[PDB]
Amino acid sequence: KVFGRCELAAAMKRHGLDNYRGYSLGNWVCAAKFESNFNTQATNRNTDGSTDYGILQINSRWWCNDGRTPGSRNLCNIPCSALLSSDITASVNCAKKIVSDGNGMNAWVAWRNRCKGTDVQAWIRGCRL
């Protein structure tokens, strides 16, 4: 599923991501665009040898288990396939664990390099949530 911009913003808000850990809703939408273009079914074979899953491209080396990544820690305690659902619940729940792991959203290099310090509200501006 490829979410509409406002559609995703609303879904993330319903799942309590707005202001979670001090991060406004705009930060999450921005990250998802750069990482997956809002595509819940996108997977990427990353530069570290593992696979990134879902709208927030969460990797199988540390966060979810796909049974194909040596040394997997499955910190989110979930199969990576759950991160490909049209229902973003699993992706949000894991994202909350990632952002609470001690480094905030810097865990997403795309957010750190492309969203951090920008007018993130621009990603929800006009959605009338």
């Binding site: 490829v2 559609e7 079914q41 996108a42 997977t43 074979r45 795309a110 492309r114």
Partner: protein, 129 residues
Amino acid sequence: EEQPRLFELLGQPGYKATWHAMFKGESDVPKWVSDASGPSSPSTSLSLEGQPYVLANSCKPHDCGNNRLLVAFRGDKSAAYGLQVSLPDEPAEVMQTPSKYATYRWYGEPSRQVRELLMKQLESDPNWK
């Protein structure tokens, strides 16, 4: 089970071949395009003028929204065609009028019909206004 993603299709000799041939001629091909890198969701099937095609997608790692690739593989593995779409990092009017700032590059010398097919696929994006 999900339709194969780009990298999985390229695992078959037939598709890998049409894929390689597709770049014969073009120059300055982006590395992420050349290596078929980045996030990819399951491919789709479609027919054009009686001929079956398999449509795959990919995008630049961590810059997915602004850098996408759509590929139309001929079902009889006779040839492949691609469309690379580039958008500027101006998250303002670009966010609401993508087509107005987008740059397109074609691979494989696609016919007018195949070009229409690929553009229509790009336009299927909920956020492509």
